[PDB]
Design a protein around this ligand. Structure first.
Ligand SMILES: NCC(=O)CCC(=O)O
Length: 487
């Protein structure tokens, strides 16, 4: 038994192991969301300002494509643990790769440093993210009611790291010491790796030491050829385009846009066409399709807060916080701390609003629509602000007010989507359903990479009013089918 080899207490009433992973995840998410806060500015800032001097649209496009690929990599990375290394092996190798990625940015390699960094982080975060989360769940026995609260505590390290890292790294942006800030994230991640290596054999026992579905002798040959050939085709395409001098980021953004739109269709077609899924379970897979649209329209506007909304506020607002007499210069990296702070403060509040009601609470469709409609209205607000003022430098309060409207929308969509990924899931397609919920983010981010190109032709202000209305009109159309969708 997996439980007969591990401690069942030791961390706020949960297995001692939950304590180890909280510290490992805190330091990984801290270095990830910290590095992410500085990268956008590191890319488009001038050479004299220690930046890379990349086109505003290209730097904006790289962020959305980087993000998409991190979430897409969880699909083959959950496969490698399930079929080759086990969850422990993939977590460890993934962590070692992430460290190399942060170190790449600390070195003066400019573009070679940026692209090699991205490549190390994309691979590592696909091997580490879905498998570290798997071990948390595996620390609890079959008939153990604590597991739900264990994940609430586990995802607290996620928002703690995301909240603290941009506050700390704001000084490294101010003094233009980018390499120093990326080095801080690299060392920050090393503390995670050390804490795992020091305290993991005793707290996590034999849980995740071997794959669940190991590959047989023939499967090692079969998959080895397919993966080997696909890798070989990619290597040549990038090398031939490079030396001819025709290689650009459009090749990356277009390939990812194809994957972003193709992957959801493939999973839904596989699940629907399956002979294992019952007619009752098939109606739930059909009912999750309009929820996926609502989830994509949400994560599209929400993830633009990391590359579009923060640059808007930096360039068009006064960047001066002003609440009831208290005034201070607002840092550009501190826009990344709004969401995690509002999740930490108001997550248990919204969790109790639904508990107070019980049977009288709204459906998954009403909840998804409220979240998407708010995200849409967040873009109407900031778009109208700019339309009203124009050339007049408005307050940073209008930008912060936009971030708040979106996180209030997330507090309705994130806990609903987590329950939807497991409840609506068929018996034989539980992992395949976890993929369709996480692909709402990977697809939105893959769309964004190309959607940022429409900022220059339409205009920065007009871009906000259009995206806001596109999200609202489509959310209201799906809302007319609220009694039909609830099956
Ligand atoms: N759980 C992490 C978040 O939702 C915060 C993302 C952000 O920093 O914008």
């Amino acid at each position: 038994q997996t439980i007969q080899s591990i401690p069942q207490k030791g961390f706020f009433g949960h297995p001692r192991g939950l304590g180890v992973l909280f510290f490992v995840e805190f330091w990984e998410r801290f270095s990830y969301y910290g590095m992410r806060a500085m990268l956008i500015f590191y890319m488009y800032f001038a050479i004299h300002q220690n930046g890379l001097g990349i086109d505003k649209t290209t730097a904006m496009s790289i962020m959305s494509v980087y993000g998409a690929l991190i979430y897409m990599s969880s699909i083959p990375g959950a496969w490698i643990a399930d079929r080759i290394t086990g969850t422990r092996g993939a977590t460890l190798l993934g962590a070692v790769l992430i460290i190399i990625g942060h170190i790449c940015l600390s070195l003066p390699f400019a573009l070679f440093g940026l692209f090699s960094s991205m490549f190390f982080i994309i691979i590592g975060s696909g091997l580490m993210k879905p498998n570290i989360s798997n071990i948390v769940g595996r620390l609890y026995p079959e008939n153990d009611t604590r597991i739900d609260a264990g994940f609430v505590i586990f995802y607290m390290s996620v928002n703690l790291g995301a909240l603290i890292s941009p506050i700390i790294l704001q000084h490294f942006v101010d003094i233009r010491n980018f390499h120093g800030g990326f080095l801080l994230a690299a060392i920050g991640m090393a503390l995670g790796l050390v804490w795992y290596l020091l305290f993991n054999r005793k707290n996590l026992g034999s849980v995740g030491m071997k794959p669940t579905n190991p590959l047989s002798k023939e499967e090692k040959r079969k998959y080895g050829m397919i993966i080997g050939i696909i890798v070989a085709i990619v290597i040549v395409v990038l090398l031939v385009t490079y030396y001819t001098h025709t290689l650009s980021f459009d090749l990356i953004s277009n390939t990812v846009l194809v994957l972003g739109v193709a992957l959801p269709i493939i999973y839904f077609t596989t699940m629907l066409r399956s002979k294992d899924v019952t007619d009752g379970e098939r109606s739930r897979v059909k009912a999750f399709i309009p929820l996926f649209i609502l989830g994509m329209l949400f994560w599209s506007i929400q993830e633009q807060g990391s590359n579009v909304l923060n640059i808007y506020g930096l360039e068009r607002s006064d960047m001066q916080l002003n609440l009831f007499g208290w005034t201070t210069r607002f840092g550009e990296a501190l826009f990344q701390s709004i969401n995690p702070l509002f999740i930490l403060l108001f997550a248990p509040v919204i969790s109790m609003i639904w508990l107070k009601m019980g049977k009288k609470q709204p459906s998954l469709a009403i909840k998804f629509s409220i979240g998407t409609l708010l995200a849409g209205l967040s873009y109407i607000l900031i778009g109208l602000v700019g339309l009203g003022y124009g050339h007049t430098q408005f307050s940073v309060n209008w930008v912060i007010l936009s971030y708040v409207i979106c996180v209030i929308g997330e507090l309705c969509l994130s806990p609903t989507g987590n329950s939807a990924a497991v409840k609506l899931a068929p018996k034989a397609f539980n992992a395949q359903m976890m993929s369709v919920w996480l692909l709402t983010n990977a697809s939105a981010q893959a769309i964004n990479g190309t959607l940022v190109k429409l900022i220059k032709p339409l205009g920065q202000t007009n871009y906000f009013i259009f995206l806001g209305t596109v999200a609202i009109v489509i959310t209201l159309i799906i809302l007319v089918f609220s009694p039909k969708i609830t099956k």
